Subunit: 129 residues, 3 copies
């Protein structure tokens, strides 16, 4: 059945203002070059990276809502252990590593992302047989 | 399987303008003090109450889309019988009462909420084994 | 289990600017009269048609994410074969035809739509026993 659900809305202008400020979470998510590019709120980079961020946040929220989260505070490494990339067609793919990959070996994570104008959004559904 | 699905988008400024106007639905949802606070569109209260409203609306829409809804018009008491609160971590919890609680005793309601800038959103999925 | 998931966000002003430009996809979706009406971004027609579009796009994205999509590029006819209408209560209904109807005879498509201010959104979940 369904294990967790998450939805996330991201302001593309707010994201652009934050994404290239030094810090481990964003450095663990995007490259310095990606972050420089996305700091321009009018850019394709800003729009597309904002949707990837929305997707990652939606997955983490779905995980935080699930039985797999034992404490209110997110576990160390979760932003390294959960990544959402897009193929050359814009379609999202979830990649897990570390402890998250270990614990979620037997669940599926569905994700969809979207954006328009100044807003990006994503939904994630974690599910098991 | 899935029983119903709902998504809701809420304008935080529009919400702030409506939330403190006298009426049973909002009075059944939030306290007078909460509604006064949220009438200021720039306030944290407005943003957070708007997301709770989006969540409640998303649950009601999921319910209205389901076999549990017998008529087009919502049943008396549904805004009293369905509430969405957040714990001190911002995580949503669904509380049912009245006839709704009775009829939905054997289904699960998943909900997620989010907000940024002038927009709040939520998704709800009702599901049964 | 879940077969595919899609979320779509639509700018109502951008939609209004595009919807009445001649082209097969929109002509296969809405009538000339509907499209003329919706070209006025301030109109009820624009808001409601934008949400129907968001819903159709969300279904197509859920389909594109599923095993039913064999190639990256959408198949011929998919915009004719997938339609989302609303009843007189604003509630969405999915209608399939052509090859899509044939291949999806044994799956369910859940859809929800919403709008406020300048934004419409929808989510779709395809599911099978």
């Amino acid at each position: 059945a369904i294990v967790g659900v998450g939805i996330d809305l991201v302001s593309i202008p707010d994201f652009a203002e934050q994404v290239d400020r030094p810090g481990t979470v964003f450095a663990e998510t995007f490259t310095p070059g990606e972050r420089r590019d996305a700091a321009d709120k009018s850019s394709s980079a800003a729009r597309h990276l904002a949707a990837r961020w929305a997707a990652k946040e939606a997955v983490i929220k779905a995980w935080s809502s699930s039985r797999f989260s034992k404490r209110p505070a997110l576990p160390e490494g979760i932003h390294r252990d959960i990544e959402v990339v897009t193929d050359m067609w814009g379609r999202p793919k979830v990649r897990l590593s570390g402890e998250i990959a270990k614990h979620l070996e037997d669940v599926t994570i569905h994700v969809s992302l979207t954006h328009e104008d100044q807003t990006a959004a994503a939904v994630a559904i974690i599910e098991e047989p």
